[PDB]
Design a protein around this ligand. Structure first.
Ligand code: TQM
Ligand code: TQM
Lengths: 138, 138
C-alpha cells in the first residue's frame, strides 16, 4: 500500500488534467496536458515513479492498456498496471475555482489547487501522510 | 534543512533543464523547458512546493531575482529566495547519455536519469533520504 496509486482524468476549459492519488494518504499530483495521448501519461508516470514508490497504478477504464509508451514506461520503471480499485476530482475543482482569477494559465491554478489539497488538514495533511507511510515503511 | 533546495540550469541539445536538489538528501527533480522564461521556473517551483517542504531556494546567479512571476510564485507558496550556498549536473549527463537512444524526447531521458539518480545507492538512496529527513522532522 505504500506503492498503490490511482490514475484518473478530469476536464476543465477543454484541457485534460491527469490526476495521480496515493490511495493510502490522499496525496495527489496533477498535470494539464494538451490532448490525452499515450506519450503524455507515460511522461507523467515516469516523473511520479522517480519521485515516489510506484508499484501499482489502477485505472478505471481501458485507455491506458492501449498505449505502447505507457506499457514501455511501466516496464522500464517496474510499474504494474491494474484495472479497477474519485470525489478527489470534485475537491480539486472547488479549489481551482477559488484561485482561477488569481493567475493566467489553467495549469498554475491546477498546481495551486494540488498545493492546498496536499498541505491542508489539526491532524496530518495528505503530504505528511505520504511521507509518514513511506518513512514508517522504509 | 528539511526545506532547503538549490535551483540550477543545465543545457543539452539546445534545451534548458531546470534542476532542484534537496541539499540534505541529494534528491533531485528536473524539467526540460523550451526557453528559461520567468514563467517556467515559477510553474516548476509551485509544483515542487506542492509536493515537498520548500522553505528556501538558493540560486547561484541573478536571473531568478528579475522575474515578477517567480517572485509571485514564491510569495504565494511561502518560499524565501536566497543568493549563494553542482557536480549533480555531471552525474545527470552521464546517466542521460547511457539512456539517450533508449527513447525519443530528451525530456524522457532526463526523467529516466532523475529516476536512476534518486533510486540508486547498500546505504540509502537520495529518495529514501529525503523521506527519512522529512519523516524524522514531522
Ligand atoms: O520519448 C518518448 O520516446 C515517448 C515518451 C514520453 C513522452 C512524452 C511527451 C508528452 C508531451 C509532449 S512529448 O514519455 C515517456 C516515458 C517513457 C518512455 C519509454 C519508452 C521506452 C522505454 C522506456 F524506458 C521509456 C517513453 C516516453
Ligand atoms: O499562470 C501564470 O499566470 C504564470 C505562471 C506560471 C507559468 C507558466 C508556463 C510555463 C510554460 C508554459 S506556461 O507558473 C506560475 C506559478 C505561480 C504564479 C503566480 C502568480 C501570481 C500569484 C500566484 F500565487 C502564483 C504564476 C505562474
Amino acid at each position: 500500500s505504500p506503492g498503490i496509486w490511482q490514475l484518473d482524468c478530469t476536464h476543465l476549459e477543454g484541457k485534460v488534467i491527469l490526476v495521480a492519488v496515493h490511495v493510502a494518504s490522499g496525496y495527489i499530483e496533477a498535470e494539464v496536458i494538451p490532448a490525452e495521448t499515450g506519450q503524455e501519461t507515460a511522461y507523467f508516470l515516469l516523473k511520479l515513479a522517480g519521485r515516489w514508490p510506484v508499484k501499482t497504478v489502477h485505472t478505471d477504464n481501458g485507455s491506458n492498456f492501449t498505449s505502447t509508451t505507457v506499457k514501455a514506461a511501466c516496464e522500464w520503471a517496474g510499474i504494474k498496471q491494474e484495472f479497477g480499485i474519485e470525489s478527489m476530482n470534485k475537491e480539486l475543482k472547488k479549489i481551482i475555482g477559488q484561485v482561477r482569477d488569481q493567475a493566467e494559465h489553467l495549469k498554475t491554478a491546477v498546481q495551486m489547487a494540488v498545493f492546498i489539497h496536499n498541505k491542508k488538514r489539526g491532524g496530518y495533511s495528505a503530504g505528511e501522510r505520504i511521507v509518514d507511510i513511506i518513512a514508517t515503511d522504509i
